[model samples]
Target: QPPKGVAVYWGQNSGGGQVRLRHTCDRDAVDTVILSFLTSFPKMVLNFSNMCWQTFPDGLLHCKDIADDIKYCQLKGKTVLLSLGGASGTYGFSSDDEARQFAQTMYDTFGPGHTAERPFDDAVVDGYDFDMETSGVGYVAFAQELNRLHSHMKKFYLTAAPQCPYPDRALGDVLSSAQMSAVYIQFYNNYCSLSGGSFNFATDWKNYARTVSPNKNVLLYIGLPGAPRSAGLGYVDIEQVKRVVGKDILDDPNFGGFMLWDASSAEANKDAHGVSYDQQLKNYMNNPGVD
Candidate 1:
């Protein structure tokens, strides 16, 4: 096994001193950094508040300055994925053509097929992440087209952030068909979440990761809130996580370790709970071979 890893979503800040992209790269705990989000599609905007804010007349957020930060993260051996969709948008395609067109646009702008006036400049990301928060029409086609466009790239990946449910309400269809390198399953803000009014990782989550499944080939990540305020109801102390996160998940063939909501919160949460969230959790997550 390469190594179980931790991933954090960046871009949105919730006050305090937020963790910059390059700063996030320096962390030993986190191995994947998801730059969220390419929200409000069709309009296609980038919103990394408190970080990059420059925009062209076309309303697209020009993120050229962070290109160096992205490269720094990559050189540090961290994977950066540009995520699409968030809770605050009404974006999705209405037809296959539009899906393919948007896929092509993203391919040039973020993926390996660089041709357009890219947002991240020449800093091509390691992968693309689909974070479908609402019901979407063209997700499958979009993911398929993205894979098709980046077919030749050696490390192009397609990952998703779906809810903890077995059949993710928003991304089930896409998850069933798309070629995903891993899934950062949002275990927060839901009934099956960690704080659990009725949580049971075995039945609620592990059942979905059993020996036979549609996404058998894809890796699974336990998505959590980096800090208490980062999510509504799923925030728990590291000890609570340690108990619930057993070898059941860690030893799974597709286990890809933990994913925190936003990098800013992780940084802002420093020592607030005695230990940093990722720092405390990474040791447990990285020791996937633990008995």
Candidate 2:
């Protein structure tokens, strides 16, 4: 149902743009696609900033309208997880009660219950991705809440996007494998921000596997968006994707795969709402041509 896995992007650069699954730039080019933050939480406050339904509700409906074409990607086997915290989420996860209320409201209805097309109803969403980098939030508590929620749902998944620095792995390392499904270490800022730069910190992951349960499935993916000159120092290239995910990384028995930050940035510059691509990265992800 997760369709192996793939990157999806959503950011301020492409907010309120003209984009839909039917007319996505990379609709037919790749396999699994992620429906990133449907709403913008510029201040960690949920349902207060960007309306969730505006971003995903009607958009998914539009995708359903052309379900036949997008079916292969969605129904056939694709994933669309709603990211909770990004650069602008709650500084300290708001509060356990706030998170529960937010999740309920989000998982409850479509855009404040205005539409009949509820994407979360049958979505293959593993769970929410946490990118609360600048903040000092406790991931363990957040994970605990998610785990409790999933205990009832049983199908909800939890993914994390932590900073690449080994020290930052502290919070993520605390999560149990059963609670955490996978993590996309911010390979973005590992020393230098070059796409193909050497991952000198490869030992970090090794140490984690050694200390943590070796049975856990930790994805060693590098983030590479279409933006060549992003504000952030860690702008990886398309080619660098495979370079980091080279024979050594992928060959390892415990590697997960790669994930683009958001569909909007990873893809092209189709205004803001559409999914486009600056590099041919999708080609490599879909058919790596390797065993």
Candidate 3:
């Protein structure tokens, strides 16, 4: 089953290395953990590259270890997924056929029917998260193709991480058209963030709801940087978040939950009141609107 509660993005430079993977998922309060950015798109014609699942600086792609840990998390009933793209990268498809071919490659590499050459070996992640910060064509088509390819799987989720701006310039049309299971809207590094009292969380959320294509119920998550340094701006005081956003938006049916930018920063943060940002946010997330 898909995980419930806060979905955290783990496995980036500031988000801790592979060794910290288990600790991130061990928390009962964290139900979803997304391993971040393949980063380098090594392929030529299609722009899809980086087969080894390697991370920065000395981390090699070790399938057995990674796979085992993924199984451990799954056994605990948590959901894990691979997040594609990053803040900086050359990604995205050049053509429809390229998109379709890339979709097939993804399934073959990571899906249930994955071959022996699968990058992460036996680790079958729950979904794919499109952190499409870069411009690209055929992404919506790519996602749909993947969904169709993995339709027979028990549950192969399709999600996106779009900027907080209402109607994300990069992904607005795709989001409004494709059937995304959830959208982790990055509420940091932008004018729509929660730091200032200006952004209308509820109103923008309502706008987002309307834009989603097919006009069906889709979960919306307020994605925030785990720490002030995680982004350029928009880090709300934890208490203020609980007071202004948590209380105000929790009851909305489409309100799925909060998404921290990454695990490491969250592990390092504290509110003005000196409470650990991780625990405090998780507390609010676990029991929203409760004092």
Candidate 4:
């Protein structure tokens, strides 16, 4: 199925207007929406800019409307993933125990069958994406714990967004240790970035992580900016994307399509012919030439 083909980072309006989340979910080009930044642990907080519901007394957002939107998206055959960490956030665990405990709370709050005085009422997210930026302890334990918890759930995916650099300083250890459903590698910003005028798949694609225990046939999705303004670097035009992300990569069993930075920018960016980068990339991938 072409369902989880493209997962766009939602919530933050990076390159385009602060368009709402459910609105973007209406587009077929968007399949899985990764909500941004559940910052901090124990005192977990959400910073979705201006796209959610009321604020809680403890500073957590209620997101009642967004909860309905999430359910609607699922009904539309699309998945929504909650992202942890971002460029900005005071999130990280001090020890394995703390990491494990947080994972349980996250599941009870975000996964199915739980309300228990948390935000987002009955909006159970499909999975979690670790978009860790800064290096810290307990991520491996945190990821492993999630792997255990979600294993009991029906269709919960464990994904990550590591930088293009091979080690990914912060998540390298966790990636090697944890079992992931898909790895959304940030092919931007860093020196090995695709927009830096070169592509280094040999060093960047860490195959060992995919074959790790509980991660058989794990998918890999390269993260790219939807538009030039979506990222500081690595906003390769849709045409260039076809040249680099050729049929060979698309035909690979593990290739999980592209991960754009944000949904708003993808809608905002348009070529002279009024084609959006989102549509262009989707078209090329659906029938990548010479495949």
Candidate 5:
């Protein structure tokens, strides 16, 4: 099924930082919030090793808080989800065993139904989207594992974050184009500017969309840097979103929506400032699903 709205990067749950989603989720910041969880995939092996669940420096915000925040958002028709397989420098492969373990854990922790410590006892989540930008892990296996997990949990969703254009170093030739629920592609990471108000991204992501598992959810999302990076291509300005989507780059039948790299940068207007450029982008929400 096609996605109903947009996703924003709340923050990286790393270095013991107290990344909170309540602020943005409650403010009606974005339709759906996408939080990235770093997994230190075992080097040369596709398995989960040790991970730092530290929430902050002074005191850690327990997973309970994360769950509560998501639950709060869900009550308002907002969806919150975890973006698995982010930019960790670890080797990864979802072998049958590895995939089952991850799936089972995710299903247990975030899956539908259950009590405290259950998949999402404290919060409500729409589904899982993986940024499998690494090769060591077989993408097809990972997608299949996610599909299996989602099957067991009704209404759970799955998506993949792939690089723009075809043949990206981060994307191997083994992705489960058939099993993915949706695909979010990076279209503006190059940090270039287009003339006469055009963005420096491929006008068309359909080529990649066509590669997803047949009859599955095929969606498009362009990556815009939030803060004052080199070219200042951070937040997804409404104009840029309109330009891209109006071009039908991601307005197809399967288009899901956009995923911001983060909410902090988008909020602070630094390192991908979210404060300064969000209004222009937020306005596009009237059109819905292009953020």
Candidate 6:
């Protein structure tokens, strides 16, 4: 699917958690917020491990605070999605059967059709995002099974966050095999970053939307670090970043706008030449002109 507008990542180590959820939704520049990592992949099924939920010894998950905020975000008209996995975790499917079982778990947890174990009560997340930073097997199969299960709904979404480098090493096979609505490629932390003119953003977007992904109409997001110290490198100056995004990224209809590394990092960056990081990025997305 083509981007509705600017999308952002909001949970994981978010300091304010749900208390700050409504504020981000009110921002004019943001349309989607991917709540990060239900992380802790003990034995391959998704578990938050006390980060966002309380898991009983018998394996019942409960997190009213998070669940309530999910509905709040939806009511506010912001698309909320659950991002699984992260940069580091004990996550991966041992076999295809394990992958399929995990997909079923996702359906029961967040998809439609009432189950006693719904994570967010009656609220169902818009979709799932595969942020497979660690090595994982059967992910293609996992995506395939999840996509199939999600198809039962009136509308469903599936996306991936692959490292920039043409073919993402961790998720290349899965991307090729599965159908994705969008892909938030991390243009930072690697040689393909937009700094120093090292990367050809337009060329890469063409390739990704045309040749690489099975879904020809896949939306592309330019992923970058929200703060200077957020990542090892590739934090371009705001002005330069905006100019690049306007000229290279927005030229294509398939462009899904850009994504910040995280909301926390952006909030931590309180010094943006006197402007807050949120305002700075929002300004760029809404109107990428220096004026």
| CA-lDDT, candidates in order | 0.78, 0.48, 0.72, 0.79, 0.54, 0.73
Model 4, global lDDT: 0.79
TM-score of candidate 3 on Cα atoms, chains taken together = 0.87
Q: Which of the two candidates, 1 or 4, achieves a greater lDDT against the reference?
A: 4
Candidate number achieving the greatest lDDT relative to the actual structure = 4
Residues forming the 10-long window of minimal summed lDDT in candidate 1: 204-213
Poorly placed runs, candidate 3 (over 4 Å): 15-18, 42-60, 246-248, 271-275, 289-291
Higher-ranked by lDDT: 2 or 3: 3
lDDT of 1 by residue, 1-291 (tens): 113588899888743467568888998988998888887776687888778888767777877667889999889998888888889766878888899998888877777666646777889898888887887788889889988898788778888898886778888778777677788888888888887855555574466555434556677788889889988878887777876778876777777788898777866676655667788778777663444
lDDT of 4 at 160: 88
* CA error at residue 10 for candidate 6, angstroms: 1.9
Query: In order, how many clashes per candidate?
Result: 0, 17, 1, 0, 27, 0
**Candidate 3, poorest ten consecutive residues by summed lDDT:** 42-51
- Per-model TM-score on C-alpha atoms: 0.92, 0.66, 0.87, 0.93, 0.72, 0.87
- In model 2, where do residues sit more than 4 Å from their true spots? 11-18, 22-32, 38-73, 91-124, 136-138, 152-155, 169-178, 189-201, 213-215, 229-231, 242-244, 269-279, 285-291
The deviation in Å at residue 144 for candidate 3 is 0.7
Model 4 stretches with alpha carbons more than 4 Å out: 1-4, 113-115, 206-214
Q: Rank the candidates by TM-score, best first.
A: 4, 1, 6, 3, 5, 2
Q: Which lDDT tens digits does candidate 3 get at residues 83-117?
A: 88887656767787888888888887667866446
lDDT of 2 by residue, 1-291 (tens): 133345554434333442554344345444434444433332223331222333353334223332332343445444445565565444444565664554444544322222355543333344566665654434455566555655555445566666666656445543344355555666664563445354633576656654563235555444544454433556655545555565665556445555565454555543243534533554555566663
Sorted by lDDT (best first), the order is 4, 1, 6, 3, 5, 2
lDDT of 4 at 163: 86
Worst 10 residues of 5 by lDDT: 42-51
